[PDB]
């Protein structure tokens with residue numbers, strides 16, 4: 039009882055479920071195979087959505103429990119945490135959005151097959167369900183969107199009990215008294231902040247010498263770290279972990295040393311979060327038998343139409359090269375299926391923004407100062423602090439700055455870097471500016487509403503273009 | 511030298527003399543100095559920054575922010591997130607202190623910016639006493655003459671009075687009195703359902719007042735707002751507790767011996783006479799240009815019927831070296847509009863071309879949900895005979911809005927039917943105020959709906975609703991709805 043299809047998508051994360059919807063909208067008979075109980079992939083079920091929910095809820099807890107609400111005349115005798123209820127709010131959002139994808143599939147006539155997909159021919163995918171039943175799909179095109187998994191730390195076994203990945207850390211049943219996080223990238227700093235805010239003593243251990251992962255601008259990263267340390271973060275940068283021991287009393291002893299060598303020490307904690315990275319997931323997909331070889335980092339090599347070496351078999355998202363982000367996977371899914379229908383296929387990874395949803399937030403798009411130097415680009419800098427922005431000052435939330443990097447000969451915007459309130463939303467104005475090739479003067483002369491945080495983006499461009507802002 | 515207050519009465523020479531230190535005047539003065547002009551700014555009030563900083567945008571946004579958080583804590587929202595509190599109490603004195611702290615910091619900042627940029631601040635009442643002369647009259651009665659090549663009038667606006675109802679800032683208040691009420695009124699009536707009125711209503715509603723807005727026109731939110739957005743906005747505000755009497759005129763108000771106020775109303779067309787009682791009456795029917803005792807009549811600068819100073823596209827009055835910008839001239843009475851006019855006016859004084867497109871000036875309403883728009887409404891496009899297409903995306907389908915349990919409203923995009931050019935953007939929902947600036951940048955380039963749809967917006971953000979509404983306008987269908 040095989041199914042015939044034009045496009046068969048393996049995986050229902052941001053890349054796969056959006057690709058499936060768009061393919062159906064373009065007229066393809068479309069199937070989407072998912073092995074998990076719900077649709078939406080890593081981002082919806084154990085990723086972006088649960089993490090942002092806990093960041094929001096823990097931020098508001100900090101505002102009520104700390105000094106902020108009192109300073110605004112909102113007085114409360116006793117603020118208490120109900121962690122079960124906070125986790126419930128998180129789970130409600132996840133359930134609503136995963137159900138929403140199932141309805142979108144029905145609305146657009148995408149056939150949902152529940153099982154573990156394996157490519158069993160150039161034009162065939164077989165999905166094996168939990169009970170061993172099979173469903174064969176004979177298909178013109180195959181779109182691999184199988185995503186990522188957590189990168190294990192050699193010698194340390196994650197059990198999601200006291201040694202957790204991001205999945206376990208998002209569902210802890212009590213606030214750990216003491217918590218250690220291996221990895222001070224985006225995911226690690228976010229999860230650190232959640233549990234710090236809810237009462238944990240948190241330490242982030244990082245082999246590199248800065249916070250925030252790859253590609254973040256160094257000046258932004260140092261300033262971000264300083265703000266976080268004032269919030270209660272403790273950082274062990276330039277530090278390697280040599281091992282972790284699960285102890286008889288339930289606690290964990292973590293052995294660390296200086297990254298360059300020496301200064302060996304041990305620190306004890308109640309929960310260890312292993313968050314050193316993620317890697318492409320292709321297990322048992324049938325690639326070896328087809329001859330589709332992986333690159334040394336486990337990614338599927340693809341061409342500019344996202345075709346593998348077998349031209350009707352495609353791959354997108356966290357399973358191929360480029361930034362491992364939800365909106366990147368989505369755009370790759372859209373343009374891949376547009377290309378299947380004969381159209382142009384374009385994504386510019388220099389215009390793909392990054393966001394860290396701490397408070398303050400961090401967001402950037404385009405090039406860092408380190409990248410411009412390494413490329414030998416002559417640039418100029420404009421900065422504007424949020425302390426001088428009217429909306430930030432009115433809200434009494436004034437950490438950080440906007441930094442703009444501009445090309446000297448043309449005034450072209452080369453990069454935008456935002457540390458402070460509203461950075462996540464603000465970077466999308468910046469992404470539009472980079473896609474259009476805007477000059478710094480262009481953005482300085484656009485009438486931004488007053489009072490808005492976006493005026494800091496305008497003023498930083500004015501500084502880069504004219505040399506001087508108005509309000510600083 | 512850089513501050514000329516009482517006792518400082520020697521004559522001054524300047525290239526540019528700016529009368530008024532509001533958003534238009536103080537930015538014009540800074541930019542003039544940065545361009546190389548010897549610049550003077552005359553201000554009659556105790557602080558710089560005009561209506562917006564002292565009694566306007568800044569205090570109102572501070573109270574909107576604080577009252578929204580009071581509502582999150584005192585209502586259901588914080589409890590839904592596992593944040594349990596025994597007793598949430600309002601300390602209005604402390605809330606007002608946070609507001610005043612912000613205003614003081616920002617007014618002090620302008621004075622520092624004037625010093626940094628070598629702008630001479632003259633504290634007095636400026637009158638134009640010759641084609642190239644302004645005389646400032648100071649608090650002590652002293653006078654100071656400024657001989658100047660150019661004059662820039664930036665004298666701003668005032669509250670529009672209501673005949674027969676005397677504002678006393680006690681129980682009958684303007685927006686100024688409403689921003690400093692000493693206690694939450696049990697019942698408040700607002701005459702005028704425009705932007706300022708709805709914002710002030712929302713503040714006091716959140717803090718415990720029973721609020722009613724009376725409006726002579728048939729919609730909420732002032733001039734130019736899209737009618738679909740306005741209707742949806744009104745329905746949301748009614749569920750928050752607002753009561754609206756649209757298409758209604760006020761015939762009078764009487765302060766009673768017991769301190770309460772009886773407001774007499776009728777249908778705008780006639781009939782249906784009623785009386786409604788309140789503890790505080792806010793008179794918010796508009797603002798109007800302020801030019802009192804400026805010397806215009808003697809110069810021969812006549813005003814238009816609404817009191818504005820007529821100017822050409824370089825912002826020149828009938829006297830070619832005398833200019834005017836901001837709330838005293840035509841166009842949207844908004845802070846960023848006054849700022850941009852001041853900048854390009856002084857750039858024009860320095861030899862540059864002068865052009866501004868009021869169709870690219872955004873408007874924002876800082877309620878929760880917010881409202882923001884830029885470009886054209888459906889009503890404008892219809893009246894102009896423009897063929898257009900519509901794309902909508904509801905915030906209920908946006909991942910960041912749903913995750914924060916903050917899902918009112920939608921983004922609506924209007925695109926040209928044949929060319930896909932973005933013609934207007936209308937946002938009702940969370941984050942509208944910041945989001946409209948992405949739309950303003952798009953309009954500057956004449957971008958298409960497809961252009962915006964193909965920009966990689968971060969996930970999860972509210973801005974994705976803007977992306978998806980453009981995708982719907984361009985392709986006919988969004989992804990996530």
Ligand SMILES: Cc1cc2nc3c(=O)[nH]c(=O)nc-3n(C[C@H](O)[C@H](O)[C@H](O)COP(=O)(O)OP(=O)(O)OC[C@H]3O[C@@H](n4cnc5c(N)ncnc54)[C@H](O)[C@@H]3O)c2cc1C
Pocket residue numbers: 048049050051052053054071072073074078079080081082084085086087089153154155156183184185186187204225319321322323354355356357362363364365366367969970
């Ligand atoms: C804690 C956390 C926070 C994050 N926060 C953000 C954020 O704020 N913003 C951001 O942009 N990104 C964020 N990310 C990253 C984001 O989750 C990923 O970039 C994105 O989910 C990748 O999309 P994808 O569709 O390529 O893969 P995935 O989301 O990983 O989806 C792959 C799907 O394929 C299924 N699958 C795999 N193999 C098969 C098979 N053989 N048969 C059937 N089904 C199969 C998997 O079960 C899964 O459902 C975060 C990630 C984590 C872990």
Ligand SMILES: Cc1cc2nc3c(=O)[nH]c(=O)nc-3n(C[C@H](O)[C@H](O)[C@H](O)COP(=O)(O)OP(=O)(O)OC[C@H]3O[C@@H](n4cnc5c(N)ncnc54)[C@H](O)[C@@H]3O)c2cc1C
Pocket residue numbers: 488489529530531532533534535552553554555559560561562563565566567568570634635636637664665666667685706800802803804835836837838843844845846847848
């Ligand atoms: C409650 C309220 C909320 C508002 N919220 C917003 C908002 O969120 N966003 C927005 O964009 N706009 C908002 N506005 C409108 C905004 O304040 C005005 O558009 C803006 O202030 C006008 O700028 P201006 O420089 O033209 O005039 P004004 O700000 O009115 O400044 C004029 C200045 O000139 C001085 N002056 C006048 N005559 C003389 C004289 N002869 N000699 C010396 N000095 C003189 C006055 O004292 C005053 O300081 C709000 C207004 C109110 C009342």
